[PDB]
From Swiss-Prot, chains A, B, C:
Ranges in the topological domain labelled Periplasmic: 7, 52-53, 92-93, 142-149, 183, 223, 266-267, 304-305
Key word Coiled coil present: no
Knocked-out gene: effects: Leads to decreased susceptibility to a number of hydrophilic antibiotics including ampicillin, cefoxitin and tetracycline. Deletion of ompF confers resistance to colicin E5.
UniProt-recorded name of the protein: Outer membrane porin F
Function: Forms pores that allow passive diffusion of small molecules across the outer membrane. (Microbial infection) It is also a receptor for the bacteriophage T2. Is the major receptor for colicin E5.
Organism: Escherichia coli (strain K12)
Keywords: Cell outer membrane, Ion transport, Membrane, Porin, Protein transport, Signal, Transmembrane, Transmembrane beta strand, Transport
Length: 340, 340, 340
């Protein structure tokens, strides 16, 4: 949906309206993702202008609006800016941009973020390199310098964000990524490291002086089938919670496995199967604990370019004896999607 | 104001800027609607796409922005999402949609919601069936199945919304509506019932286990004159306040009368007269009390399709001895409207 | 970027994405403007319709979105409506509008508000006549009545805004402005006076019963050079802070000097030099104190109509012995700008 393309600047305003309802037992106190109305809406703009033949300029913004709130004092719950960045792009040297963007481990973790509603549990927001972080300076090179094509690599720097809370805070850091596609396949390497703030060190769960994250994945996005497998590891950069002690902090070391498989049909139904197991290792008091564990059967039906429905059915395999109390119940998600 | 109609999807972005100032005595502590600056602004999008000849898809979102706030810590006061929904529509069977939409009693109560600023006092927001409620699943049939035209009927289901406050909360419920227009006239039937939450039961004002609402109205929207009369009743679903006790809750039974009359001229001035009397019956301690009571003379001048002014003058007839302290003073509202 | 111009109504949606990073020593506790990520984004619409040949109608809205926040509970920090107003315009008598707009001293103080990021320190928001105030009723005349052109004058009325805080509050007031441009030059007179609220009187810093502001400036915006000089004075209308006592209030009398100089080149780099000195006189306990004091060297490079970069380097000349603890450190600002 492009609205203004006149001089050298093309501007498209994009948004979506999603009507969701979650299905769980109880009130969602022991469940994955909860229970009840969780509808929302999105709105943002993407910009692109040509300064000359080679150097271009771009910027993007995106917002999250929530419809499951009331019209009272609880109106802005989960209303937030997902993207806010701007930068330039030259021909062969690459592109620099700055603002609120993703991390460089999301190049690996984004391969299994293809489910209807859930999935991409390892891609936590404000988790130093795996989600949308405010204050990132990213340099991306698409095809090496024109030397070979289908060989992506990027380099990121992270700015110091000392907030009031310890879950969203981070410090200075450096990351990088290497990707390669050929014959419809795909392989991604990614690694990032950042130094912690003193508010994050004083938390009871987790102790350390540097937060390291890495991941590597594969891909078979060709011939209407999708297959991917991400394996990653994380030191001092995983947000955990202890509901038995009411103490929150980070995990010392965490190992993550994600799988996904999809098939697209000609009329437009897309079945999906997925498996995710994230295990936190050597946390204080507990030992080895499993954070995320589910099988998944779901399906997405695409009516056209703009209208869609999806059903997403979580089979939680946490064995209801978790020492962190992560919540172990099955969840069904049924949604209706319009976008432009 | 439609901006993008290219492939099968027409998207129009709509908004308005309203500059309001209320006129009352004192600070609005004993007044209807208050005193001072109450300007605001709206913004949203409406979407419509054709999947094929018969099945279409649609979605809508709307936001309220407030200009009477400052640029300090009180910025988002009364900033909220009014509409957020999405659904499909087939040819003869009807249309299903889900999200944040109106209720099915608003088909009756919307006939007298035609004033410049005020009016539609019975149409409270988050009052189970008479305003915009988040989590509604509505099925609407326009003309019966093509069998007769000018015969509307709808069926709604309400989802359980157990919030932190008791005024916005609700439970599961079922409602329905029947409408009929012929020869420019109109007649609407509407009824809805929902079961209360346990936070609503523990409130001191009002006690009960089910919230029932119904209304029925008439219409003469033809030949540039407007005439309508809504009569409705409500059991356990009316938000009241006791300023003498500082206790808030619901009313046991409430009976509501609304009248309106308008005339449009060729140059564009629209005078208005209205009468609203809402009476709460058998509340604890008080007995029978009158919540809403006013005469009204107002006028709206339309410059063109987009620019307008209106004056709206409340003659409050609450006799300054109300046992709930509802506020009994006259209020003038003067506004300037731009929209697109 | 105009999107809808069809019937008589032209509507343009405008926004920008700015990626900023501030450079200071420490955490910005003794600095001008702070330290760290300060990126943001803007979005709004401007409207214009012709009712007939002479009378037109217009309205505008603008919002501030902040990207330096997280996606947690601190999401809406500094998110606010900058503009919200609407009104009409006739041919020769002028134009009336109402809502949230600027003040009439901003006609004088806006001449030196031409820096890349900083500058316009005297133009405080919600400071009765020098910033964007909610509840203003402004009448502006462009060229006198068609009698002479290049002679602007305006008259403003201020409504009573009794808020919860004393910094954003104000009372009823009257202001006016006179401007004159000829041969590329410019000269502006401006004055405004308003009566204080009782919450503003009870504050320890500053005491008085009326807030008076005035300013007068010059201009040489011709032949690609810019030169301007604003001198203004202010009685009982300047927000000050005492970090040594943790007491906040207003200043009794304040005198302000602003200078600016710019040069535009053909390829698009714009160097800038500026000098601002604001001095508060006869405050309680301190005496005469200097609030704002800096030299400035900065530059803005315009790539095209839509893409730009700027560097802005504060040379703070507060002598680190200020009795109010205003903060005395140098600050560099580096930004990347996209707009449409």
């Amino acid at each position: 949906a492009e609205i203004y393309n006149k001089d050298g600047n093309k501007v498209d305003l994009y948004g979506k309206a999603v009507g969701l309802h979650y299905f769980s037992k109880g009130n969602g106190e022991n469940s994955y993702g909860g229970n009840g109305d969780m509808t929302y809406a999105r709105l943002g703009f993407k910009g692109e202008t040509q300064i000359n033949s080679d150097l271009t300029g771009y910027g993007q913004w995106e917002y999250n609006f929530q419809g499951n709130n009331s019209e009272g004092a609880d109106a802005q719950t989960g209303n937030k800016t997902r993207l806010a960045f701007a930068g330039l792009k030259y021909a062969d040297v690459g592109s620099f941009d700055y603002g609120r963007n993703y991390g460089v481990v999301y190049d690996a973790l984004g391969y299994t973020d293809m489910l209807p509603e859930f999935g991409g549990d390892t891609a936590y927001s404000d988790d130093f390199f795996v989600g949308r972080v405010g204050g990132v300076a990213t340099y991306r090179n698409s095809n090496f310098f024109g030397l070979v094509d289908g060989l992506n690599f990027a380099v990121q720097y992270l700015g110091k964000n000392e907030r009031d809370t310890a879950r969203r805070s981070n410090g200075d850091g450096v990351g990088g990524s290497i990707s390669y596609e050929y014959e419809g396949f795909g392989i991604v390497g990614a690694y990032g490291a950042a130094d912690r703030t003193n508010l994050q060190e004083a938390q009871p769960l987790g102790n350390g002086k540097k937060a390291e994250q890495w991941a590597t994945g594969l891909k078979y996005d060709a011939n209407n089938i999708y297959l991917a497998a991400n394996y990653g590891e994380t030191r001092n950069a995983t947000p955990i919670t202890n509901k038995f002690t009411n103490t929150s902090g980070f995990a010392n070391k965490t190992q993550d496995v994600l799988l996904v498989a999809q098939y697209q049909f000609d009329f437009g139904l897309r079945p999906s199967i997925a498996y995710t197991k994230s295990k936190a290792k050597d946390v204080e008091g507990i030992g080895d604990v499993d954070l995320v564990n589910y099988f998944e059967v779901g399906a997405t039906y695409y009516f056209n370019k703009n209208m869609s429905t999806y059903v997403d059915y979580i089979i939680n395999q946490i064995d209801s004896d978790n020492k962190l109390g992560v919540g172990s119940d099955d969840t069904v998600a049924v949604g209706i999607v319009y976008q432009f």
